[PDB]
Enzyme design. Structure first.
Site, PDB file in Angstrom:
ATOM      1  N   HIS A  69       1.590   0.838  -4.961  1.00 55.50           N
ATOM      2  CA  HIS A  69       2.247   0.433  -3.727  1.00 55.50           C
ATOM      3  C   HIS A  69       2.560  -1.086  -3.741  1.00 55.50           C
ATOM      4  O   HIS A  69       3.707  -1.531  -3.503  1.00 55.50           O
ATOM      5  CB  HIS A  69       1.370   0.831  -2.536  1.00 55.50           C
ATOM      6  N   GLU A  70       1.556  -1.885  -4.065  1.00 51.89           N
ATOM      7  CA  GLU A  70       1.734  -3.316  -4.091  1.00 51.89           C
ATOM      8  C   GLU A  70       2.750  -3.765  -5.143  1.00 51.89           C
ATOM      9  O   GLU A  70       3.656  -4.577  -4.840  1.00 51.89           O
ATOM     10  CB  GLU A  70       0.378  -4.029  -4.254  1.00 51.89           C
ATOM     11  N   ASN A 103      -6.538  14.242  -9.396  1.00 52.48           N
ATOM     12  CA  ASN A 103      -6.460  14.770  -8.017  1.00 52.48           C
ATOM     13  C   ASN A 103      -5.469  14.008  -7.138  1.00 52.48           C
ATOM     14  O   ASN A 103      -5.867  13.438  -6.119  1.00 52.48           O
ATOM     15  CB  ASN A 103      -7.813  14.771  -7.277  1.00 52.48           C
ATOM     16  N   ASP A 127       3.472  -5.492  14.004  1.00 48.45           N
ATOM     17  CA  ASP A 127       3.584  -4.996  12.641  1.00 48.45           C
ATOM     18  C   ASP A 127       4.993  -5.292  12.090  1.00 48.45           C
ATOM     19  O   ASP A 127       5.585  -4.502  11.356  1.00 48.45           O
ATOM     20  CB  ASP A 127       3.251  -3.495  12.620  1.00 48.45           C
ATOM     21  N   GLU A 149       8.346  -0.509   3.110  1.00 51.85           N
ATOM     22  CA  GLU A 149       6.980   0.023   3.103  1.00 51.85           C
ATOM     23  C   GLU A 149       6.930   1.485   2.644  1.00 51.85           C
ATOM     24  O   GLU A 149       6.006   1.892   1.917  1.00 51.85           O
ATOM     25  CB  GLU A 149       6.297  -0.127   4.481  1.00 51.85           C
ATOM     26  N   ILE A 177     -16.567   8.394   5.478  1.00 54.29           N
ATOM     27  CA  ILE A 177     -15.836   9.575   5.955  1.00 54.29           C
ATOM     28  C   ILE A 177     -15.002  10.228   4.829  1.00 54.29           C
ATOM     29  O   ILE A 177     -14.137   9.577   4.234  1.00 54.29           O
ATOM     30  CB  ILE A 177     -14.870   9.169   7.085  1.00 54.29           C
ATOM     31  N   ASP A 214      -2.370  13.336  -4.430  1.00 54.42           N
ATOM     32  CA  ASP A 214      -2.054  13.903  -3.132  1.00 54.42           C
ATOM     33  C   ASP A 214      -0.895  13.127  -2.473  1.00 54.42           C
ATOM     34  O   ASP A 214      -0.371  12.152  -3.039  1.00 54.42           O
ATOM     35  CB  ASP A 214      -3.290  13.878  -2.216  1.00 54.42           C
ATOM     36  N   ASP A 269     -10.224  11.625   4.793  1.00 53.29           N
ATOM     37  CA  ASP A 269      -9.277  10.781   5.517  1.00 53.29           C
ATOM     38  C   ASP A 269      -8.569   9.775   4.587  1.00 53.29           C
ATOM     39  O   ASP A 269      -8.947   9.591   3.437  1.00 53.29           O
ATOM     40  CB  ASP A 269      -9.978  10.033   6.649  1.00 53.29           C
ATOM     41  N   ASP A 328     -18.641 -10.210 -23.745  1.00 51.60           N
ATOM     42  CA  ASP A 328     -18.798  -9.143 -24.731  1.00 51.60           C
ATOM     43  C   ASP A 328     -17.761  -8.024 -24.661  1.00 51.60           C
ATOM     44  O   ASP A 328     -17.910  -7.035 -25.361  1.00 51.60           O
ATOM     45  CB  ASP A 328     -20.212  -8.535 -24.656  1.00 51.60           C
ATOM     46  N   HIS A 336       4.865  -0.641   9.065  1.00 48.87           N
ATOM     47  CA  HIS A 336       3.852   0.258   8.501  1.00 48.87           C
ATOM     48  C   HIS A 336       3.681   1.536   9.352  1.00 48.87           C
ATOM     49  O   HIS A 336       2.856   2.412   9.030  1.00 48.87           O
ATOM     50  CB  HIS A 336       2.479  -0.435   8.407  1.00 48.87           C
ATOM     51  N   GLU A 379      -6.727   7.089   0.170  1.00 50.40           N
ATOM     52  CA  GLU A 379      -7.915   7.920   0.387  1.00 50.40           C
ATOM     53  C   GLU A 379      -9.082   7.451  -0.499  1.00 50.40           C
ATOM     54  O   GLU A 379     -10.247   7.506  -0.084  1.00 50.40           O
ATOM     55  CB  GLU A 379      -7.610   9.410   0.129  1.00 50.40           C
ATOM     56  N   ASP A 424      -2.728   4.682  -5.930  1.00 50.94           N
ATOM     57  CA  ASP A 424      -1.649   4.599  -4.950  1.00 50.94           C
ATOM     58  C   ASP A 424      -1.539   3.197  -4.349  1.00 50.94           C
ATOM     59  O   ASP A 424      -0.427   2.705  -4.170  1.00 50.94           O
ATOM     60  CB  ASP A 424      -1.716   5.679  -3.850  1.00 50.94           C
ATOM     61  N   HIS A 469       6.382  -3.269  -4.285  1.00 49.75           N
ATOM     62  CA  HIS A 469       6.998  -4.301  -3.456  1.00 49.75           C
ATOM     63  C   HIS A 469       7.701  -5.331  -4.352  1.00 49.75           C
ATOM     64  O   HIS A 469       8.746  -5.871  -3.999  1.00 49.75           O
ATOM     65  CB  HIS A 469       5.950  -5.017  -2.590  1.00 49.75           C
ATOM     66  N   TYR A 483      11.511  -7.700   5.337  1.00 51.91           N
ATOM     67  CA  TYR A 483      10.240  -7.104   5.743  1.00 51.91           C
ATOM     68  C   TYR A 483      10.028  -7.010   7.258  1.00 51.91           C
ATOM     69  O   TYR A 483       8.950  -7.346   7.751  1.00 51.91           O
ATOM     70  CB  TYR A 483       9.084  -7.909   5.143  1.00 51.91           C
TER      71      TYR A 483
HETATM   72 CA   LIG Z   1     -12.766   7.850   3.556  1.00 55.44          CA
HETATM   73 CA   LIG Z   2      -3.108   9.214  -2.540  1.00 57.69          CA
HETATM   74 CA   LIG Z   3     -19.408  -8.128 -20.046  1.00 59.10          CA
HETATM   75 CA   LIG Z   4      -6.069  11.100  -4.755  1.00 56.54          CA
HETATM   76 ZN   LIG Z   5       3.189  -2.449   1.691  1.00 63.87          ZN
END
Ligand SMILES: [Ca+2]
Ligand SMILES: [Ca+2]
Ligand SMILES: [Ca+2]
Ligand SMILES: [Ca+2]
Ligand SMILES: [Zn+2]
Length: 316
Positions: free
Chosen positions: A142-143, A183, A226, A166, A197, A185, A200, A59, A231, A190, A138, A146, A157
């Site tokens: 980010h992806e 918003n 890594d 990265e 939490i 940053d 962070d 739908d 990273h 985040e 973000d 790449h 890499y």
């Molecule tokens: Ca969090």
């Molecule tokens: Ca961000």
């Molecule tokens: Ca649907």
């Molecule tokens: Ca944000």
């Molecule tokens: Zn990456």
């Protein structure tokens, strides 16, 4: 698929309602024909075979909880696409409007996302460390960045070249976040990191150290994990780019900020005209210097700020 372009509505990962471009042919598909050769979002159905199925809905209304990550992956790819077209005159990741494809519901409890060489892939998170990763713009940007890097500088890499790869994805992910302007940053992930939490994130550009990442070259990781810390050492470049844009005094070195748009211009130019698959941090410093020179002149404030920002993170 072949169909008429249409407009659906759904709810994303964070509960926010948005319109999405779909295609109608018996079912409504998450196929947006308004951007290049199209944006295509797939259902991996909790498995790891890719891409899975082109997302089909009866739908054109996407308010089920199962629908949310697909809604965001589709929408935020559209936003990222708009950023590159409108801000850098770049048509999709290859510059020639390649189809942008993404799969969601990848595996079970998968706490990551990635570009696999051909497409974007998003886990659902385990609900504790992460919620569905396409929820963060973000993260999406980010992806997709790449793919951009892989078609242009082609930064390998691992080690410093990998850290640069990265960092560029963190930089443009952030610049796309600010472009969408909800918003925004200087933090990474985040919106989808640790639902229990507040405040962070996975990484920080303004304060890499907050999460144990180097914010100066003397503190670089030199081991093998890594992929040689791609990273981890990105933090050194992330802080350089944060400084360039926002200014500050870091380990005693003052930097006059030049703002976000100029950072983007300089780094987009470095990425597309000067970086190579093997570029290290020092060559990144020169590429950015040369870019700013090109764009603003060798005696500019812009070139001056690029130099102090890299001085500040210990990159000569
Ligand atoms: Ca969090
Ligand atoms: Ca961000
Ligand atoms: Ca649907
Ligand atoms: Ca944000
Ligand atoms: Zn990456």
């Amino acid at each position: 698929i072949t169909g008429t372009s249409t407009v659906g509505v759904g709810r994303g990962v964070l509960g926010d309602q948005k319109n999405i471009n779909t295609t109608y042919s018996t079912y409504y598909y998450l196929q947006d024909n308004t951007r290049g050769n199209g944006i295509f979002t797939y259902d991996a159905k909790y498995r790891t075979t890719l891409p899975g199925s082109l997302w089909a809905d009866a739908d054109n209304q996407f308010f089920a909880s199962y629908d949310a990550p697909a809604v965001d992956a589709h929408y935020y790819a559209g936003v990222t696409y708009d950023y590159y077209k409108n801000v850098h005159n770049r048509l999709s990741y290859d510059g020639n409007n390649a189809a942008i494809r993404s799969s969601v519901h990848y595996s079970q409890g998968y706490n990551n996302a990635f570009w696999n060489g051909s497409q974007m892939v998003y886990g659902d998170g385990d609900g504790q460390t992460f919620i569905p990763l396409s929820g963060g713009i973000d993260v999406v940007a980010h992806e997709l960045t790449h793919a951009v890097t892989d078609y242009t500088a082609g930064l390998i890499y691992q080690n410093e070249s990998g850290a640069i790869n990265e960092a560029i994805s963190d930089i443009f992910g952030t610049l796309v976040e600010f472009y969408a302007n909800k918003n925004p940053d200087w933090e990474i992930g985040e919106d989808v990191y640790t639902p229990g939490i507040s405040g962070d994130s996975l990484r920080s550009m303004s304060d890499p150290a907050k999460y144990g990442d180097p914010d100066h070259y003397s503190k670089r990781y030199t081991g093998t994990q890594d992929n040689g810390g791609v990273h981890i050492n990105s933090g050194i470049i992330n802080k350089a780019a944060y400084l360039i844009s926002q200014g500050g005094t870091h380990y005693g070195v003052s930097v006059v900020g030049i703002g976000r748009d100029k950072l983007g211009k300089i780094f987009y130019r470095a990425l597309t005209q000067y970086l190579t698959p093997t570029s290290n941090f020092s060559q990144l410093r020169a590429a950015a210097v040369q870019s700013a020179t090109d764009l603003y002149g060798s005696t500019s404030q812009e070139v001056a700020s690029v130099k102090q920002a890299f001085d500040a993170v210990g990159v000569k």
